Design a protein around this ligand. Sequence first.
Ligand SMILES: NC(=O)c1ccc[n+]([C@@H]2O[C@H](COP(=O)([O-])OP(=O)(O)OC[C@H]3O[C@@H](n4cnc5c(N)ncnc54)[C@H](OP(=O)(O)O)[C@@H]3O)[C@@H](O)[C@H]2O)c1
Ligand SMILES: NC(=O)c1ccc[n+]([C@@H]2O[C@H](COP(=O)([O-])OP(=O)(O)OC[C@H]3O[C@@H](n4cnc5c(N)ncnc54)[C@H](OP(=O)(O)O)[C@@H]3O)[C@@H](O)[C@H]2O)c1
Lengths: 411, 415
Amino acid sequence: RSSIVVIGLSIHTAPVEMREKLAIPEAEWPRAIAELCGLNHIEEAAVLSTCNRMEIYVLALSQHRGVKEVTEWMSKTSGIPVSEICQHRFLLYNKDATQHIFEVSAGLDSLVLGEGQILAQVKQVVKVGQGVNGFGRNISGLFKHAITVGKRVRTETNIASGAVSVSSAAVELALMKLPSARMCVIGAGKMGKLVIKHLMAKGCTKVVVVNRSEERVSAIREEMPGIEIIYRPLDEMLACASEADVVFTSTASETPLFLKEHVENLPQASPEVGGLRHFVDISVPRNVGSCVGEVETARVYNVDDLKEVVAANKEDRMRKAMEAQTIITEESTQFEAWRDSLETVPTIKKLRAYAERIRVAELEKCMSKKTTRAVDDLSRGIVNRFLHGPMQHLTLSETLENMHALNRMYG
Amino acid sequence: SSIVVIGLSIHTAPVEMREKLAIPEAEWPRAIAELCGLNHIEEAAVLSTCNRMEIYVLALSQHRGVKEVTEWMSKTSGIPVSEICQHRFLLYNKDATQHIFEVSAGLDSLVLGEGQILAQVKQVVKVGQGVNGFGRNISGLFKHAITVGKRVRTETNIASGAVSVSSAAVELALMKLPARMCVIGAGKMGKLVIKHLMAKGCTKVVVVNRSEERVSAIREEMPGIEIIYRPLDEMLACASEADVVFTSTASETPLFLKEHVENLPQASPEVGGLRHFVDISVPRNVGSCVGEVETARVYNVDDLKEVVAANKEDRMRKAMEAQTIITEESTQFEAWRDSLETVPTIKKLRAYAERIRVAELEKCMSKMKTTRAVDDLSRGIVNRFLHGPMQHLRCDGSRTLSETLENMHALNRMY
Ligand SMILES: NC(=O)c1ccc[n+]([C@@H]2O[C@H](COP(=O)([O-])OP(=O)(O)OC[C@H]3O[C@@H](n4cnc5c(N)ncnc54)[C@H](OP(=O)(O)O)[C@@H]3O)[C@@H](O)[C@H]2O)c1
Ligand SMILES: NC(=O)c1ccc[n+]([C@@H]2O[C@H](COP(=O)([O-])OP(=O)(O)OC[C@H]3O[C@@H](n4cnc5c(N)ncnc54)[C@H](OP(=O)(O)O)[C@@H]3O)[C@@H](O)[C@H]2O)c1
């Protein structure tokens, strides 16, 4: 009866300036989930917060009321009015929802038509969620089965991770906008490391890397001997951007690192590269204020702006994204069977108790007329000899029909 | 297992051939047991009338049961298997039930000239009672036919085969004249022929019967007509004094052959010196050779078929509603018949439970006045645990069919 619902904003609809207001740091996922499960028609929840999407997966008692509650909650936490959110809201139920989260995890819904993508993020959601009570059987199962799908599709389609494609796209765009340009990367985590790899493969031999800690950059430097990596601590940020022509920002900061004030005071980029400083900001929330675009000699790009790249062997238009959909169609119906095989739990318990109410009444009825252990045992023996059979019968399609039968034949 | 109808009917076979297949009511039990004695025939019924001969069976295998029944038909009629094959009418399952519902209603598309066989269906069920082979599927089929026939009668008022045959007999006889009436046989059909003679204005009839009791009874119940009894041995003389002779005895051999009637003096010149034999008996009471006599005309139930059909259509009312009744009950029957596949699991379940119960009861009774209580506990627990699965295996027809049957397979798996 109860529905699994997906309720989201994605890059397919909402802009990054809208989407980043529903962004939920990993450290606040357990809090978010608890809040959602506090709503009257929501029993389980999970948040999938990535750069292309903010998606809330719930197990709702009522579809309509679940959607009203989660949407009102989105409005409260983000600051965004319900009316705006509804205009960009994405909504699917049950089979469509599991279908969706399978395509997302496989890389068949985001932005390039041949991508990872969210397999790493679906694993992170399962990790973080293990302690979280609200992350119950249904939604955890969905996500776990999404991990399975992600991996299968990955080996068939061989489609690179979403992290690989966004970083790849950042380098292509920078090289697109440029007519030796000085490269600078702020945030040496997974993504900035990827940006650096893509710059190397493009032939870049020197990059200045600004990071919170030096240790990460030390690792990367040790790991990539071929290129000259120059570490700079975060408080030297503004010096770096001024000695750079393009600035990649890839940090988990929840507030912009650059406002209009910071960049207008920066010396102009070299005329050799057109006199413009290209801020390529692949962070969500963004590390660059959109006001920076008011600065004449500056250019700002965010994840949404990687859409005018999307060019990398388009022949996977079918192959990858075709070989994968068959996987998705078989795993879905497999998962639905699995979901249906969960109501088998309330049945095993109940049926036992159903026979236990008959056993007790008849026992009691008899005892009003250690022979007492004899008849107690007789009453247990008859019942166990009737439960024992149905105990294992609760293939999976025959186990399912067994369950439905007991329910019809009893309660 | 399928329900099969295997028939010859006036749609294709003349009476000279049909009558060889005719099976008297006293021999239904023998025939059904002969039939059920075949390797693939679990149940059987014989529907013998003047327009048709139909065997209804429950067969293990469609082609094998049919070949076996066909052989039995040939073996009991004298008719070679290849002639029978030529005329053989065949329908399976839902088509067969639809068919028997129509025949019972007097709505057989292929035999338009017959009238309701409801009386004859009721008789088959009545005689079937004591007949081993007349099983639950076929008796059920026939009983449902009975219900359909009655409903359809109440809605359309299609006459019986009996009424419509005797009525056609008199009508035809009157069409062939521009008359001294004789009727041979005073049972159901002959009484009806007399009634239709009165209905038409006849005030005198010579009635030849084997026993007088029947004719005395008729004589008394119909005081307005002069009824002249005459023993069977005199029937030839009666013929020589009649201008039309109705024959309607259950004799399985002919009463008049050509030698008998070429002998007789010519019928009155006032009816055109032709003596009309209207023979409504199957098997025929009048030899066909009688038609070779120049001053004579013979007719049999085959010749009535058009005049029966015309009258049935003339008096036709509420055809659609009738066909609705048939379509719906057909599916209601299939529903009831699907329901029956639940009986074996019910018994197996009940044997299973009883074996557990006594086993556990004897355990307790080897460890111990109060023996009926401890007994009661055991049956009480079983019956109460079983009652749900026992009311969810019995249904009528609606939905719950698929569920009921899925409980069956589940109960099969879990035990
Ligand atoms: N990962 C993806 O699949 C994906 C794809 C595209 C874009 N993005 C976006 O890109 C950004 C980075 O993601 P990531 O996966 O690279 O993260 P990550 O591996 O966890 O590292 C984030 C980096 O940002 C730094 N950082 C964290 N908080 C900061 C703060 N408050 N101020 C300044 N620096 C801070 C960290 O420095 P330390 O090493 O010293 O801790 C680290 O180098 C995020 O906004 C993310 O949403 C993610
Ligand atoms: N009933 C129908 O719906 C139907 C329709 C059309 C035609 N028919 C045919 O018409 C014939 C009569 O049927 P029914 O239902 O009217 O019969 P019925 O009520 O059972 O009576 C049959 C009559 O035939 C006589 N009879 C029986 N055996 C005889 C024999 N060996 N020799 C001379 N007479 C004999 C009987 O004499 P007793 O009185 O002395 O016993 C009785 O008068 C049958 O051949 C039948 O197939 C039947």
